[PDB]
Amino acid sequence: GSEVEILKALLELKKSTAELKRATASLRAITEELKKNPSEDALVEHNRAIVEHNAIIVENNRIIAAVLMLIVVAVGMTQEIKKALEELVASTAELKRATASLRAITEELKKNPSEDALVEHN
Amino acid sequence: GSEVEILKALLELKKSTAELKRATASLRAITEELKKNPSEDALVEHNRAIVEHNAIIVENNRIIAAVLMLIVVAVGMTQEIKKALEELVASTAELKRATASLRAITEELKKNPSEDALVEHN
């Protein structure tokens, strides 16, 4: 379950990091090459839009991974919860047996109020 | 005076800005190209040192310009100070003339205490 989902989240962080590094490299290549001749308006404006789009995508990937890590941590407790439930089920069944026993004792004690029945009640 | 010094400070800001933009571009080109093969240790370590040196130089240029602007502003007031001094000198000379006149009046009033001398005193 979470063993693979988390490995994929780590792969995502690796890829969004590489994207950030490359987007930053183009950000700078753009500033240095385009300031040489501002008349190349389409090239500088298109590349700046590209850089902003990548920066947003990187930030979104970070947030998405941050949320999915909370889902993953909830998932990783599956076996601990399963064992807690098995214990709760066994406890419920034992409580039921004790209740049925007490009911039978109550009926026996009222029908035949022997001292032994009072001892069994306690 | 300050007319040229300030133009040079502006030229400095232009050149340190161009340096910053280029140093940043190499910072990124270095990260993206060197992470491809970390075994090229000398190239990545030398270029990172280059980037740190340039970043420091840019910060120093900013501080130096900030101080020189204070010297320049002090320099630009040369004519206002010169005129204030011309006024102060004329005032001092007038005060001296008034003092010498008063001394002569005092001598005349004591030697010949005519009412006119008292009027001149006041």
Side-chain angles (χ1 to χ4, degrees):
Chain A
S2 67
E3 300 84 356
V4 176
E5 183 180 346
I6 197 167
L7 290 171
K8 292 294 186 183
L10 290 173
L11 180 59
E12 180 181 343
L13 292 172
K14 182 175 179 177
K15 295 295 184 182
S16 72
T17 299
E19 178 186 333
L20 180 61
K21 290 175 179 174
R22 180 64 73 190
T24 304
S26 73
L27 191 159
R28 272 70 184 174
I30 294 160
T31 299
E32 280 290 295
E33 295 302 313
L34 273 291
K35 77 178 199 291
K36 289 176 177 176
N37 185 345
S39 71
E40 294 292 350
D41 57 338
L43 179 58
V44 74
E45 291 297 325
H46 291 170
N47 288 350
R48 287 174 178 168
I50 295 292
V51 171
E52 290 180 352
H53 295 324
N54 289 347
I56 293 167
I57 292 167
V58 171
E59 178 60 3
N60 287 341
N61 287 342
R62 184 184 69 80
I63 294 167
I64 292 165
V67 174
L68 292 174
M69 283 300 297
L70 295 170
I71 293 169
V72 171
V73 70
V75 172
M77 293 177 66
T78 300
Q79 292 79 0
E80 292 180 347
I81 293 168
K82 180 177 70 171
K83 287 286 175 181
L85 287 170
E86 289 182 357
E87 289 182 336
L88 187 59
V89 173
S91 179
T92 298
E94 193 68 52
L95 185 60
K96 180 175 84 76
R97 286 190 288 274
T99 300
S101 180
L102 182 62
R103 184 192 67 82
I105 292 167
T106 298
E107 289 175 337
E108 182 64 20
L109 177 56
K110 180 61 183 63
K111 290 178 181 179
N112 184 7
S114 175
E115 186 68 14
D116 290 344
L118 182 59
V119 172
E120 288 292 290
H121 166 73
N122 283 330
Chain B
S2 67
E3 300 84 356
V4 176
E5 182 180 346
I6 197 167
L7 290 171
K8 292 293 186 183
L10 290 173
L11 180 59
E12 180 181 343
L13 292 172
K14 182 175 179 177
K15 295 295 184 182
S16 72
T17 299
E19 178 185 333
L20 180 61
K21 290 175 179 174
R22 180 64 73 190
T24 304
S26 73
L27 191 159
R28 273 70 184 174
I30 294 160
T31 299
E32 280 290 295
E33 295 302 313
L34 273 291
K35 77 178 200 291
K36 290 177 176 176
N37 185 345
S39 71
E40 294 292 350
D41 57 339
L43 179 58
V44 74
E45 291 297 325
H46 292 170
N47 288 350
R48 287 174 178 167
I50 295 292
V51 171
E52 290 180 352
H53 295 324
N54 289 347
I56 293 167
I57 292 167
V58 171
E59 178 60 3
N60 287 341
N61 287 342
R62 184 184 69 80
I63 294 167
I64 292 166
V67 174
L68 292 174
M69 283 300 297
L70 295 170
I71 293 169
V72 171
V73 69
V75 172
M77 293 176 66
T78 300
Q79 292 79 0
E80 291 180 347
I81 293 168
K82 180 177 70 171
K83 287 286 175 181
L85 288 170
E86 289 182 357
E87 289 182 336
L88 187 59
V89 173
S91 179
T92 298
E94 193 68 52
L95 185 60
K96 180 175 84 76
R97 286 190 289 274
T99 300
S101 180
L102 182 62
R103 184 192 67 82
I105 292 167
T106 298
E107 289 175 337
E108 181 64 20
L109 177 56
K110 180 61 183 63
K111 289 178 181 179
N112 184 7
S114 175
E115 186 68 14
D116 289 344
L118 182 59
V119 172
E120 289 292 290
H121 166 73
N122 283 330

